[PDB]
Design a protein around this ligand. Structure first.
Ligand code: OCA
Ligand code: OCA
Ligand code: OCA
Ligand code: OCA
Ligand code: OCA
Length: 582
């Protein structure tokens, strides 16, 4: 009351307050030294302490955004570091924060993190343990500006536990890398997942996220009531709205309240929350967000009884057009847990469109009576796509599956930059190794919910530099229909060939001097360049040049001495390929 910062300090505490302010500062001013961020956080914490000690102190009743902006731009006073940012904080709330959000670089030009030796890492750990953990938050926060802040506090705790457990014992080297690598891959998957949730609130509105939350939570929490699911959805939407507009202090405070409420009303929500609700505060919310789907309630009546066979459907729709569709989404999702969340949203939109033109055109009960008949093609379209791709995946392997997707997606949109095409196809091919081994029931909720994340990552890296018109049309037209739009484009008859570049196929030594993961990009980039060279003459039989590439690589890999072999066989191979018109 009368002091939001004091209330946040009292709720979160001292350790979480200082960590949640460092993340906020690092996610805004990405190209800034660590020491300045530490000083700013210390000043903010001291001001919060002074306002806590005496309520009627110097002015501290203003909102957190005002203090955030004042400490942000009225103290740093850097203009050359961030362009067009000097005039950013000339407006008032809430226009200042909106201007600040648009300057967050999704892919900043920062050096890749390199891990020192274990001995040096744990020598620095047990020298400034408080400061050593603060640097971990800074780098992750500045490299992922949209990373979920309350989830970043869990990762720091796991980092501290991993460092404490291993190198205060024998075999320091082979204890830390296995566990640190788990965090790195777990942190890159929870940052791309939040980006999809965070770009669906500021591009498609709050109503888009509410329907997603209703569909997802009804699947995870069946046998509950619509009143409870609505409350959970409202709380979740309020939580995720604040983390997207920079209110990290309030976002982490509201998440704890939601977790506490879920644990309190455990019997009325789900029976699988017994274990997740006996964990520490930072682990309860993580466990709840990933709890498994509860068992379906027994003897559920058919949905056709009160949605298509009753002469009040359009009357109820006209009474309230946003809760009637909420009930349909809730009832159709609880009894169909094998559908992806984006499919259920598609069927809900189809049902809404059918109802729109039925009660406003002559007899109503003549065109929405068979609305369930047109759900079949929508259901069968992605079931006939996962089935073929998983079969194709388990006949070529991971590396050859990524190449197959890379060639397919290069002909569809042959204008995106080669690094973006290579990166998206590498992530596209990793859904085969992820959950093509699941049973047919669980294949759909996993595959499409990951394809959505990958395609959103494709869209956000294309908005800054829009080069392809087809990508723009599929990205900024509908969130749910993003995947069907991409898997509906034929080969592009436009995009006259990129001509021939001699320097492209000039593999000179290296290749066989470093690890295998990053040498694959050296060949996938060449494949992308080859496909763009001949977009039309891209039949399957002329793509046998991959075998020649592999043979040429192997011949000089086993004969690394006299590195002129690389150039000689490279020019011979490119001449042979050009002579074959392929
Ligand atoms: C990767 C290590 C997992 C440990 C979880 C956190 C334990 C603690 O710090 O209390
Ligand atoms: C895209 C689905 C539209 C109908 C569901 C409405 C539920 C909600 O908005 O909370
Ligand atoms: C119950 C507390 C946890 C919910 C907030 C985060 C869930 C999500 O990532 O969607
Ligand atoms: C248990 C209350 C402490 C608040 C968060 C600190 C991490 C944790 O132990 O969950
Ligand atoms: C289980 C699906 C494997 C990858 C699908 C991507 C292909 C496409 O979008 O056309």
């Amino acid at each position: 009351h009368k002091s939001e910062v004091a209330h946040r300090f009292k709720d979160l505490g001292e350790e979480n307050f200082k960590a949640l302010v460092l993340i906020a500062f690092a996610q805004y001013l990405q190209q800034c030294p660590f020491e300045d961020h530490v000083k700013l956080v210390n000043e903010v914490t001291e001001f919060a302490k002074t306002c806590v000690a005496d309520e009627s102190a110097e002015n501290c009743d203003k909102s957190l955004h005002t203090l955030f902006g004042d400490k942000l731009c009225t103290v740093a006073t850097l203009r050359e570091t961030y362009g067009e940012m000097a005039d950013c904080c000339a407006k008032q709330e809430p226009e200042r924060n909106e201007c600040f959000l648009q300057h967050k670089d999704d892919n900043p030009n920062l050096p890749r993190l390199v891990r020192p030796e274990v001995d040096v890492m744990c020598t620095a750990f047990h020298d400034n343990e408080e400061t050593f953990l603060k640097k971990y938050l800074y780098e992750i926060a500045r490299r992922h500006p949209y990373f979920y802040a309350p989830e970043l506090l869990f990762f720091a705790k796991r980092y501290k536990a991993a460092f404490t457990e291993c190198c205060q014992a024998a075999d320091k080297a082979a204890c830390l890398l296995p566990k640190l690598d788990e965090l790195r891959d777990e942190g890159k998957a929870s940052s791309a997942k939040q980006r999809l949730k965070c770009a669906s609130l500021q591009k498609f509105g709050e109503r888009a996220f509410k329907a997603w939350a209703v569909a997802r939570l009804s699947q995870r929490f069946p046998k509950a009531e619509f009143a409870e699911v609505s409350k959970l959805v409202t709380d979740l939407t309020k939580v995720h709205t604040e983390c997207c507009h920079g209110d990290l202090l309030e976002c982490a405070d509201d998440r704890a309240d939601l977790a506490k409420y879920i644990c309190e009303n455990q019997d009325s929500i789900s029976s699988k929350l017994k274990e997740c609700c006996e964990k520490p505060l930072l682990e309860k919310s993580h466990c709840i967000a990933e709890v498994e789907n509860d068992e379906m309630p027994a003897d559920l009546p058919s949905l056709a009884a009160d949605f298509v066979e009753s002469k009040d459907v359009c009357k109820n729709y006209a009474e309230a057009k946003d809760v009637f569709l909420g009930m349909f989404l809730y009832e159709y999702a609880r009894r169909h847990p094998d559908y992806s969340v984006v499919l259920l949203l598609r069927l809900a939109k189809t049902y809404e469109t059918t109802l729109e033109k039925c009660c406003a055109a002559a007899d109503p009960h003549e065109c929405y009576a068979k609305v369930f008949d047109e759900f079949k093609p929508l259901v069968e379209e992605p079931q006939n796509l996962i089935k073929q791709n998983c079969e194709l995946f388990e006949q070529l392997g991971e590396y050859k599956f990524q190449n197959a997707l890379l060639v397919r997606y290069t002909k569809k949109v042959p204008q995106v930059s080669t690094p973006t095409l290579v990166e998206v196809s590498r992530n596209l091919g990793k859904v085969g190794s992820k959950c093509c081994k699941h049973p047919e029931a669980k294949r759909m909720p996993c595959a499409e919910d990951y394809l959505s994340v990958v395609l959103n990552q494709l869209c956000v890296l294309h908005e800054k530099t829009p080069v392809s018109d087809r990508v723009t049309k599929c990205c900024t037209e509908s969130l749910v229909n993003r995947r069907p739009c991409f898997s509906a484009l034929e080969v592009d008859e436009t995009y006259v060939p990129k001509e021939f570049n001699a320097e492209t196929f000039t593999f000179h030594a290296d290749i066989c001097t470093l690890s295998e993961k990053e040498r694959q990009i050296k060949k996938q980039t060449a494949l992308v360049e080859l496909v763009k060279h001949k977009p039309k003459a891209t039949k399957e039989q002329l793509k046998a040049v991959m075998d020649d590439f592999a043979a040429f690589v192997e011949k000089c890999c086993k004969a690394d001495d006299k590195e002129t072999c690389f150039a000689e066989e490279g020019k011979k191979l490119v001449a042979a390929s050009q002579a074959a018109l392929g």
